Amino acid sequence: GPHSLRYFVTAVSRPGLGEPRFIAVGYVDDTQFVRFDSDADNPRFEPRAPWMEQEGPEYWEEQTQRAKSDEQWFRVSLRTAQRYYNQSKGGSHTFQRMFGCDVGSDWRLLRGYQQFAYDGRDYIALNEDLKTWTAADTAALITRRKWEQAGDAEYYRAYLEGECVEWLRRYLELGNETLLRTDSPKAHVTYHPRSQVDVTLRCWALGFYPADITLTWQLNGEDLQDMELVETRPAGDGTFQKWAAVVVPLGKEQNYTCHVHHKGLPEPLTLRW
């Protein structure tokens, strides 16, 4: 079945107050496994899941060194972006990068990512062909041309195809117990008085992994009037939670049904009050 390795990296400039803060976080599927945070006295790349802890010093050394190279790159990029955009000096700005690989059942690279944002907006991104770049604007075009001259795409492609998938594979091995689990949601419906005419029904899905789920209300088996659907959220114990609420006329509660689709469900649930 499908899996992903992804890194999320951010530098924020703090002018007059020090060097930009630089953080990189690594995820395998929905699970965080590593970080580097420049805010430390002796910043090192660091484990963030139990199953990474037995990686030897050569792992953390190498990764540290690569994170620190990127730190310097991000400082240069912040300065350059500000120049290319004609922005007033001072001001805090952010540069972000998101990168990694997806695999299917396949263990051949299904998709690779190398994308960047300045101040929270697309700056440049490697397209799905892993050969060409989309520049978000006139500024990022300068960068694209420079990355074209250097042949950066092919270099990233070798990473995406080779080392990225190779290390995802190792990580799934190390974390196989946790990373490979399917926790199916426990769902129920709660009833809350609203007014002499109506009530709220809240459909919950609790304790599920991975995060992806579809949770919905129907009225007479047709889809579905306003519904409140909260953003999927961490329980903090490696499972997720979600609910969807609908305001219903008193005496027609039995008309409405909640539906939950999730990988760990043999058959999608239907709940009714």
């Binding site: 990189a24 590593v34 994170a67 990127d70 440049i124 960068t143 270099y155």
Partner: peptide, 9 residues
């Protein structure tokens, strides 16, 4: 594994 950016912007 983390891979640093190859070339400057």
């Amino acid at each position: 594994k983390y891979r640093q950016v190859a070339s400057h912007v």
